[PDB]
Design an enzyme around this catalytic site. Sequence first.
Site, mmCIF file in Angstrom:
data_model
loop_
_atom_site.group_PDB
_atom_site.id
_atom_site.type_symbol
_atom_site.label_atom_id
_atom_site.label_comp_id
_atom_site.label_asym_id
_atom_site.label_seq_id
_atom_site.Cartn_x
_atom_site.Cartn_y
_atom_site.Cartn_z
ATOM 1 N N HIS A 1 0.823 -1.187 0.000
ATOM 2 C CA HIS A 1 0.000 0.000 0.000
ATOM 3 C C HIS A 1 0.864 1.247 0.000
ATOM 4 O O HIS A 1 0.304 2.338 -0.145
ATOM 5 C CB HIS A 1 -0.919 0.038 1.227
ATOM 6 C CG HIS A 1 -0.339 0.288 2.624
ATOM 7 N ND1 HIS A 1 -0.067 -0.616 3.562
ATOM 8 C CD2 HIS A 1 -0.005 1.515 3.164
ATOM 9 C CE1 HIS A 1 0.395 -0.007 4.631
ATOM 10 N NE2 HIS A 1 0.436 1.274 4.379
ATOM 11 N N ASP B 1 -0.409 -7.483 1.121
ATOM 12 C CA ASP B 1 0.129 -6.153 1.290
ATOM 13 C C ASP B 1 1.657 -6.264 1.214
ATOM 14 O O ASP B 1 2.339 -6.283 2.237
ATOM 15 C CB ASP B 1 -0.325 -5.583 2.640
ATOM 16 C CG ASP B 1 -0.140 -4.056 2.724
ATOM 17 O OD1 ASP B 1 0.331 -3.426 1.771
ATOM 18 O OD2 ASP B 1 -0.480 -3.479 3.752
ATOM 19 N N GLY C 1 2.926 5.679 9.564
ATOM 20 C CA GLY C 1 4.294 5.944 9.108
ATOM 21 C C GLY C 1 5.164 4.694 9.264
ATOM 22 O O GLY C 1 6.236 4.555 8.654
ATOM 23 N N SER D 1 1.878 -3.833 8.132
ATOM 24 C CA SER D 1 0.792 -3.517 7.246
ATOM 25 C C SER D 1 -0.130 -2.492 7.884
ATOM 26 O O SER D 1 -0.330 -1.431 7.278
ATOM 27 C CB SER D 1 -0.035 -4.768 6.914
ATOM 28 O OG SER D 1 -1.126 -4.474 6.012
#
Lengths: 4, 198
Positions: free
Chosen positions: B36, B63, B141, B159
């Site tokens: 992502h 992911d 972050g 993730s």
Amino acid sequence: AAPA
Amino acid sequence: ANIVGGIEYSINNASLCSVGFSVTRGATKGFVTAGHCGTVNATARIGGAVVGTFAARVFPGNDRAWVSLTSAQTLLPRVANGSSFVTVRGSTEAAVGAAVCRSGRTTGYQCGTITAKNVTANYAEGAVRGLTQGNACAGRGDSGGSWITSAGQAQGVMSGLNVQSNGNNCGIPASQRSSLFERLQPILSQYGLSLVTG
């Protein structure tokens, strides 16, 4: 839950 | 730049994520991170300089992603723990109950235990299945960052989590945290990557  | 697990990099001069692990694919240098964090060919920068571009990713569903680096980058078998480092030794997957730590640019190095495997996260974009859950805390972050045991066994990349209004889940008891990471092994075999170890 959320991304990151 | 020296490529160390846990450190910040930006994607197309906008989002921030954290480096997961130094890897190679034949003569190509790269690092694994979260899918992502960027789309294919998005530009990765570390400290203002371009280090490489997103080579492949799958998000949602899974992911995962890896960024191919220019050859000027120095790949290191290490994960940042404050001013210190944890050496990456391999990728034996740890079982539930095992202690594990994670490293990323928002909350630093945090430790906890694996509490469940094969969790589905339902993000706005779609479901991501097969994630492992730990109760180490993390914040916005930290995505893409290293999850590793103290013994140096790489577990996966950050993730997502049950983020609270302060941007992290570090202010709620461990019992209530759901921090999820993508397993490393399927990422390594899907892209034919080999982990850098020391």
